[PDB]
Design a protein around this ligand. Structure first.
Ligand SMILES: *[C@@H]1O[C@H](CO[C@@H]2O[C@@H](C)[C@@H](O)[C@@H](O)[C@@H]2O)[C@@H](O[C@@H]2O[C@H](CO)[C@@H](O[C@@H]3O[C@H](CO[C@H]4O[C@H](CO)[C@@H](O)[C@H](O)[C@@H]4O[C@@H]4O[C@H](CO)[C@@H](O)[C@H](O)[C@H]4NC(C)=O)[C@@H](O)[C@H](O[C@H]4O[C@H](CO)[C@@H](O)[C@H](O)[C@@H]4O[C@@H]4O[C@H](CO)[C@@H](O)[C@H](O)[C@H]4NC(C)=O)[C@@H]3O)[C@H](O)[C@H]2NC(C)=O)[C@H](O)[C@H]1NC(C)=O
Ligand SMILES: *[C@@H]1O[C@H](CO[C@@H]2O[C@@H](C)[C@@H](O)[C@@H](O)[C@@H]2O)[C@@H](O[C@@H]2O[C@H](CO)[C@@H](O[C@@H]3O[C@H](CO[C@H]4O[C@H](CO)[C@@H](O)[C@H](O)[C@@H]4O[C@@H]4O[C@H](CO)[C@@H](O)[C@H](O)[C@H]4NC(C)=O)[C@@H](O)[C@H](O[C@H]4O[C@H](CO)[C@@H](O)[C@H](O)[C@@H]4O[C@@H]4O[C@H](CO)[C@@H](O)[C@H](O)[C@H]4NC(C)=O)[C@@H]3O)[C@H](O)[C@H]2NC(C)=O)[C@H](O)[C@H]1NC(C)=O
Lengths: 208, 208
């Protein structure tokens, strides 16, 4: 019958002042026969009620997808609180309890390195600027590129990868026109991770 | 009832001489009531019979997982042949036909760049060597590191990422002891992709 999924808040929401992080409970596969759903949000076993149950949009396979949203505390998430969402629907012989929390296991500070474009790329219209971030745990992270205190459009970041030591790494590639690089502009890789000081660090990258 | 999945061959198998690439049909969720499964392998509609149906290992949720394996031609896969695997089981009102093939869409040759370690890492026991591969389509690829004609252990590669242009990129990080790099050894990033000459290319990386 019904299958339930459960989602962590975004890394940036748990790390930066005054954002509103959110655990999300998504129930999928309820028919027209038993579509009346109901949630119960518990924070470390203790029941709480500041939840947001979105009304039930239909589907493209004739089921219903109900989404409840539970605002959490940035610090409640960082201190390892469990968030179990209890689901009710007659199509189930018994309610579904799915629980979620931050990755357990020793945290490790990311190491942030910048890499200038390989001398071979320097004959294309655009060039690639590279951020290596490595050594971090848990894998929850946010990486961003800017320049002169303003963000960047044309960058892409790889998912976190398990490294040989059991920590994570990733790369961010920032693509800019060759000229902007030749001209000597300054670009920054901003990283957000819990094991950083103030959850934030920044390494620059420019010509030499 | 039964849900069926379908898997492409490994990128290296379709690109290098004399390997044996394989499409794999994995049926999941069959009970003890209707566990008698049956396959039918078609190559571009035309039925074929050089298939390998593994006998049905049980599970940890009391279902059966049946796996048939179909050897394909390296060139039949590169020329866009469709491989539909037809599945039969009484728990289904009708057989399940899942079809699979190489990514359609114009292929693009990867551009392979090597990046030496950031001058900041040069105070750790080990250093990171970096291979950027970019501009390729379809995302099916194989990247490997070696040194003096022999492979490397301690390297990790990111999944292919969709770039802003609709092509893919990735990075491969090779971790070596600092000394091995200081000493001036030569390391190579080998790339395999269909849009390369002979499906293979290699860029080196050493000290200056
Ligand atoms: C009827 O249709 C619906 C709708 O889906 C689609 O809708 C139509 C329009 C088409 O597009 C169709 O393609 C399709 O029908 C179907 O509902 C789907 O049901 C499947 C389950 O079979 C669910 O798959 C799961 O996906 C989650 C992750 O999903 C996130 O990312 C998806 C994209 O990759 C995205 O589609 C989802 O919306 C969701 O997106 C996130 O949403 C939140 C919202 O708050 C957001 O904050 C996030 O940022 C956002 N992320 C983004 C943007 O992508 C995945 O985790 C599940 O994988 C686990 O479970 C699988 C078992 O089903 C198992 O195979 C995997 O290996 C994996 O295993 C898990 O492993 C972890 C540890 O790593 C463990 O903790 C877990 O317990 C374990 N799971 C197990 C085994 O229990 C899973 O693959 C889809 O979410 C869902 N689609 C949507 C959009 O809701 C439905 O199937 C159709 N009916 C039928 C035919 O049956
Ligand atoms: C009973 O148990 C079985 C076995 O699970 C095991 O035991 C249970 C108890 C749990 O503890 C599990 O955690 C444990 O693993 C369960 O069977 C599972 O069923 C789910 C579906 O609900 C399947 O999930 C799918 O996973 C595929 C890819 O799976 C590969 O990689 C997995 C790890 O990443 C690995 O677990 C799989 O074995 C498989 O491994 C591959 O194997 C081949 C063999 O040749 C090998 O070559 C590969 O190298 C290897 N790969 C890796 C990485 O190791 C995933 O693609 C599926 O996602 C699609 O479907 C989802 C719906 O569930 C949906 O959410 C996704 O969006 C996605 O939808 C697809 O989207 C694509 C485009 O992106 C589109 O083209 C497709 O059409 C569309 N799919 C369709 C058809 O709609 C999916 O998540 C697991 O394969 C399967 N587990 C195993 C081990 O087979 C079962 O759930 C249990 N019973 C129940 C119901 O409770």
């Amino acid at each position: 019958g019904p299958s339930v999924f459960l989602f962590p808040p975004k890394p940036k929401d748990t790390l930066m002042a005054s954002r509103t992080p959110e655990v999300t409970c998504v129930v999928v596969d309820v028919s027209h026969e038993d579509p009346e759903v109901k949630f119960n949000w518990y924070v470390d076993g203790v029941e709480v009620h500041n939840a947001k149950t979105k009304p039930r949009e239909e589907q493209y396979n004739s089921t219903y997808r109900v989404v409840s949203v539970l605002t959490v505390l940035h610090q409640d998430w960082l201190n390892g609180k469990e968030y179990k969402c209890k689901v009710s629907n007659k199509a189930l012989p018994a309610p579904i309890e799915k629980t979620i929390s931050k990755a357990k296991g020793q945290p490790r500070e990311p190491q942030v390195y910048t890499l200038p474009p390989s001398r071979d790329e320097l004959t294309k219209n655009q060039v690639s600027l590279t951020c290596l971030v490595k050594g971090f745990y848990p894998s929850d992270i946010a990486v961003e590129w800017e320049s002169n205190g303003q963000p960047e459009n044309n960058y892409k970041t790889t998912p976190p990868v398990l490294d040989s030591d059991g920590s994570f790494f990733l790369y961010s590639k920032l693509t800019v026109d060759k000229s902007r690089w030749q001209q000597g502009n300054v670009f920054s890789c901003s990283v957000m991770h819990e094991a950083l000081h103030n959850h934030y660090t920044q390494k620059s990258l420019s010509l030499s």
